[PDB]
Paper text:
It exerts its functions through binding as a monomer to the tyrosine kinase-type IR, which is an (αβ)2 heterotetramer in which each individual αβ extracellular chain comprises L1, CR, L2, FnIII-1, FnIII-2 and FnIII-3 domains.
In the cases of [PheB26]-insulin and [GlyB26]-insulin, we aimed to investigate the structural consequences of the loss of the TyrB26 side-chain hydroxyl group or the whole TyrB26 side chain, respectively. Although the dimer interface is maintained in this structure, the release of the PheB26 side chain from the water-mediated (Wat1) hydrogen bond to (NH)CO of GlyB8 (typical of wild-type TyrB26) leads to relaxation of this surface. The Cα–Cα distances between wild-type (TyrB26) insulin and [PheB26]-insulin increase from ∼1 Å at the B25 site to 6.3 Å at LysB29.
Residue numbers in the entry:
A (entry chain B): 1 to 30
B (entry chain A): 1 to 21
The structure:
């Protein structure tokens, strides 16, 4: 069934979208 | 944090938004 989890590169892309001009901090597990 | 909340579990928009700068 469709997956709602946001992981890895998909998670940092989500932050890129939602944060917009505010930016963000992130730490990859990889 | 964000991986447990949004990758292991499922998170909502304002949970995500709270991680922004």
């Amino acid at each position: 069934f469709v997956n709602q989890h946001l992981c890895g590169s998909h998670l940092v892309e989500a932050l890129y979208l939602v944060c917009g001009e505010r930016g963000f901090f992130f730490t990859p597990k990889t | 944090g964000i991986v447990e909340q949004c990758c292991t579990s499922i998170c909502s928009l304002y949970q995500l938004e709270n991680y922004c700068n």
